[PDB]
Structure 1
């Protein structure tokens, strides 16, 4: 893309370091299906750019 990766990093940056959010939350606000959201979230995780907090659902933040 060009790029769902950058859009997410912003929503979290604007949210402020140390604050988390769910994929379901990012889905409805970025107008993007939760499916594509998670595959990018986990992609960012494999790049150490994001940190996941286990749970149901999982929480994502910049840290």
Structure 2
């Protein structure tokens, strides 16, 4: 949760990353990325494009 919030905040607002791209780059097991992806997006610490496999980026709230 700390390694994901530190990489999504440094990348650059407006960006976007897929679970498959986050579980294949750091190795992290999907079973761990799917449980943290639905726990961070619910807390409002991560947007959720139209659909699960859609995409993921910092809080949608932006300019």
Q: Which runs of 5+ in 2 are unaligned?
A: none
Q: Which runs of 4+ in 1 moved over 2 A?
A: none
Q: Which runs of 5+ in 1 are unaligned?
A: none
Distance change in 2, residues 1:28/1:16 (3 Å): same
Please tell me the root mean square deviation across aligned C-alpha atoms, in Å: 1.5
The Cα offsets for residues 5-62 of structure 1, whole Å up to 9 and x where unpaired, read as 1111122122111101100001012221122102101100111111100236220100
Q: Distance between the aligned counterparts of 1:52 and 1:40, measured in 2?
A: 13
Which protein has the bigger helix share? 1
The number of residue pairs the alignment matches comes to: 59
